[PDB]
Structure 1
């Protein structure tokens, strides 16, 4: 089997992407944030504290003939931006782009933090990291991809995120029309539960490539590219007027600036992030100061190849016995 679903930016900055997912019988369609940096499929629901729901579409398990409560099971998650959610657990039928998993753990939120409430466009998350990070207790549950794997034509999914445009998540096949040139594959460590890999270096604009190992994660659920302070300083040093602002929370630059591209290495291959992808717009409405899309990972504890990087590539998440990641230009 295979699946193919379009993913759509939630706003004009590509802050996140939403993908329609069918849950239950008859189908209830919710728009979920596919997150390769976490491993819980959780939804706003009929159980979510009423005051914490604001415009989201909710899953109502009592209206699904295929829903079953996983008795006694609970979940609770905290993300890198400090947001969180928690609740109880159902199993139900979940379909993405024509691909159906029966008995998928669907984690029903009883509580969500303010950032989730305040984002009316995101009805929940669909985790695509390794199931070892799943937060269900007492017994950890499998991700949608883990459950689908054995039925897939090939044990893979691909992320093809758009710049200011929709893109595609495919399951079970590689669309050879969706990229240019060849896909370069690179090793993955699952030791921390993430799609963790080592970039071979970087270049700024037309500069020479610096060969240096940068360990990080491929994370579709993080907006920006977070890299070591050395690398990030070297980038912004090439932008007139750029500076790190502690008050704003990162590097800012004059909105009038022309941003250089940023190249990262995948083995002997190279992915070029155009300068425009690094512009995240005014720091506040009407400001002539803009927020940078490449920021320091210092204090996160891990480097994160988030959407700014991933949307410059066609990315293969290969869930074979020995997992790998593939990157192609497009």
Structure 2
């Protein structure tokens, strides 16, 4: 089997991407944030504290004839941006783009933090990291991809995120019309539960490529590109007037600037992020200071190839017995 679903930016800055997901019988369609950096499929629900729901579409398990409460199971997660959610667990039928899994753990939120409440466009998350990170207790649950994998034509999914435009998540096949050139595959470590890999280096604009190993994670659930402070300083030094602002929490730059591209290495291959992908707009409405899309990972403890990097590529998440990651230009 295969599935294919369109993923759409939630706003004009590509702050996140939502993909429609059918849950239950009859289907309840929710728009979920597909997140290769986490491993829980959780949703706003009829159980979510009412004051914490502000415009999201909710899953109502009592209206799904295939929903079953998973006895005694709870979940609780916190993300690197400080956000969090928790609740109970159902199993139900979940379909993405025509691909159906029965008995998928659907984690129903009883509580969500304010940043989730304040984002009316995201109805929950669909985790696509390794199932070892799933938070359900006392019996850990499998991701949607892990449950689908054996049925897929090939044990893979691909991310093709758009810049200011829709894109696609495919499951079970590689669309050879969706990229240019070849796909370069690179080794993955699953030891931390992530799609963790090592980039071979970087260049800023038309500058010389610096060969240097950069270990990091392919994370569709993180908006920005988080890299070592030395790399990020080298990037922003090429933007007149850019500076790291402690009050804002990262590098900002004059909105009148034209940003240079940023290239990262995948083996001998090179993925070029156009400068415009790095502009995240005014720091507050009407400001002429703009937020940068490449930021230091120093406070985080891991480098993160988030949407800013991934949307410049066609990305293969190969879930074969030894997982690998593939990147192509597009």
Question: Which TM-score tier does this pair reach, normalised by the shorter chain?
Answer: over 0.9
SS at 1:315 equivalent: strand
Q: Once the two structures are superposed, what CA deviation does each residue of 1:222-247 show, in whole Å capped at 9, x if it has no partner?
A: 00000000000000000000000000
Question: Partners of 2:61 and 2:219 in 1: how far apart?
Answer: 30
Structure 2 residues without counterparts, runs of 5 or longer: none
Q: Residue 110 of structure 1 aligns to a residue in which SS?
A: strand
**Per-residue deviation, 1:25:** 0.2
Deviations 1:22-58 (CA, angstroms, capped at 9, x unpaired):
0000000000000000000000000000110000000
1:269-284 alignment, distance < 5 Å: 269-284=269-284
What is the match of residue 178 of structure 1?
A: 178
**Residue 95 of structure 1 aligns with which residue?**
95
* Structural RMSD (CA): 0.3
Instruction: Report the Cα distance in structure 2 between the residues aligned to 1:104 and 1:169, rounded to whole angstroms.
Output: 19
Shift of 1:206: 0.4
Note the C-alpha offset of 1:122.
0.3
Name the count of aligned residue pairs. Answer: 330
Matches within 5 A, 1:173-252: 173-252=173-252
Q: SS at 1:177's partner residue?
A: coil
- How many angstroms apart in 2 are the aligned matches of 1:210 and 1:4? 37
C-alpha deviations, 1:88-135, integer Å up to 9, x for none?
A: 000000000000000000000000000000000000000000000000
Cα offset, 1:299, TM superposition: 1.3
Aligned to 1:60: 60
Kindly report which structure 2 residues correspond to 1:44-55, keeping only aligned pairs within 5 A, or say none.
Answer: 44-55=44-55
Alignment partners' CA distance in 2, 1:298 and 1:269: 26
TM-score (norm 1): 1.00
Residue 5 of structure 1, CA deviation: 0.0
TM-score for both structures, normalised by structure 2: 1.00
Where structure 1 has 5 or more consecutive residues not aligned to the other structure, the ranges are: none
Q: Which runs of 4+ in 1 moved over 6 A?
A: none
CA distance, structure 1, for counterparts of residue 166 and residue 149 of structure 2: 25
- TM superposition shift of 1:158: 0.1
